Amino acid sequence: TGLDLGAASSFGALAPQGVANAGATVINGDMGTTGTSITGFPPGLITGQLHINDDTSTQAFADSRTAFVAGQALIATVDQAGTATLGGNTFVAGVYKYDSAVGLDGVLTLDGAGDASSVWVFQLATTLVTYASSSIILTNGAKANNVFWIVGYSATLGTYSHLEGNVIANALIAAQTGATINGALLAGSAVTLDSNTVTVQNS
C-alpha cells in the first residue's frame, strides 16, 4: 500500500506555480514546473532533467496529484487525532492520521521491523512544520522511498532539518536554510528552497 508517483517519481522538486531557490542547493533528481518560472539555478544545481512547462512536467504534475488523492483516500491504521508532535517517537509501518497541525522537534524514528517493504503514510490534515536540526531516522529495513508525507495544507522544513520520505503537499513546500531531504518535494503550489540538498530515493 505504497503510492505510485508515476512520471513524478524521478523529481526532487515539482510544483505548478514554480520553484524559487536561494543558495548552493543541490537537487539529485529532476526538477520541474507546469508554470514557467524557476529561479535561483544557479546558484542552485540539479543533477537530472529540468522540465519547464512541457509534456513531462504536465504528466509528472498529474501523477503527483493522483498520488496525493490516493494518499488521502487510504483508511488510517493509526488514528493520532489531535496529537501535535512527531518528535520522540518510533513508528512501525502504518497509515497515520493526524487531524491538525503537527510539528517535528527532535528525532522521529521509522522502524522497518525487519521488513524492507514497510510503508508509512502520514495523513497530515493541515500543516507540517519541522524544527531546526530536527531529524527523521530509518531503522531495521525502513526505506525512505516507502515513506509518504501527505500534507493537507503546506509543509515547512526547519533550518538544517533532515527529512526522509516523499513530501506531497496540497499547497506549498518551503525548505528553510540548510534543510536536507532523502525523498522528494511534490508541491501543489510552489516549492521554495534555501541551500538545500534533496536526493530522490528508489526501491
Numbering used by the authors: 1 to 203
Lines quoted from the article behind this entry:
We examined such water molecules located on the crystal structures of AnpIBP and the S153Y mutants. In crystals of AnpIBP and S153Y, the asymmetric unit contained six molecules and three molecules, respectively. Mutations in S153Y and T156Y on the B-face resulted in a decrease in activity to 17% of the wild-type. All AnpIBP mutants exhibited highly similar CD profiles to the wild-type, suggesting that defective mutations did not affect the overall structure but collapsed a structure needed for ice binding on the B-face. In contrast, the defective mutant S153Y generated a hexagonal bipyramid, as produced by fish IBPs. In FIPA analysis, the illumination of S153Y was observed in six patches at the middle latitude of the ice hemisphere. This result indicates that the S153Y mutant loses the binding affinity to the prism ring, as it occupies the equator. There are at least 13 polygons on the IBS of AnpIBP, which are mainly located around S153 and T156. Such ice-like polygonally arranged water molecules were not identified on the solvent-exposed IBS of a mutant, S153Y, whose TH activity and ice-binding ability were lowered. The illumination area of T156Y was further reduced in comparison with that of the S153Y mutant, suggesting a significant loss of binding ability. These results suggest that Ser153 and Thr156 on the B-face are the residues necessary to bind to the water molecules constructing the prism ring of a single ice crystal hemisphere.
Here we present new structural data for an IBP identified from a cold-tolerant fungus, Antarctomyces psychrotrophicus (AnpIBP). The structure of AnpIBP consists of a 45-Å-long β-helical fold with a triangular cross section. The main constituents are 6-ladder β-helical loops, which are supported by a long α-helix located along the β-helical axis. The AnpIBP uniquely binds to the water molecules that participate in the primary and secondary prism planes, which were detected as a prism ring in the FIPA experiment.
